[PDB]
């Protein structure tokens, strides 16, 4: 009741809680999602062999 909710207006006049600008903080799982994994090209190598 003090801070409000999706179904309760905050007691502070005309106050609503801040909105998120990203839905999930965990971005590793977003990157590992199926859509992005089947959209992206195959990865290179983290380490490269020294030639010459």
Partner 1 sequence: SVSRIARALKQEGAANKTVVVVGTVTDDARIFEFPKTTVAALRFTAGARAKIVKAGGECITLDQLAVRAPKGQNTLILRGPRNSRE
Partner RNA sequence: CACGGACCAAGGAGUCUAACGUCUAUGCGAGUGUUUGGGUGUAAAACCCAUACGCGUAAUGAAAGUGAACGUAGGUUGGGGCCUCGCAAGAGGUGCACAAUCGACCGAUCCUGAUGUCUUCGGAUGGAUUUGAGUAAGAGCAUAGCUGUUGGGACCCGAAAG
Give the residues lining the site for partner 1 (CB under 8 A). Answer: 16, 19-24, 27, 30, 33, 35-36, 39-40
Q: Which one of 7-15, 27-35, 41-49 is the stretch in contact with RNA (CB under 7 A)?
A: 7-15
**How many degrees, rounded to 5, is the angle at CA 5 between CA 2 and CA 8?**
75
What is the distance between the alpha carbons of residues 17 and 5, in angstroms, rounded to a whole number?
8
Decide: 36 and 30 in contact? Cβ < 8 Å.
Answer: yes
Q: Which one of 10-18, 28-36, 44-52 is the stretch in contact with RNA (CB under 7 A)?
A: 10-18
Binding site for RNA (CB under 7 A): 11-13, 18-19
């Amino acid at each position: 009741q003090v801070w409000g909710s999706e179904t309760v207006a905050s007691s502070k006049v005309g106050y609503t809680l801040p909105s998120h600008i990203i839905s999930t903080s965990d971005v590793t799982r977003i990157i590992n999602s199926s859509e992005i994994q089947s959209a992206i090209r195959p990865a290179g190598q983290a380490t490269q062999k020294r030639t010459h």
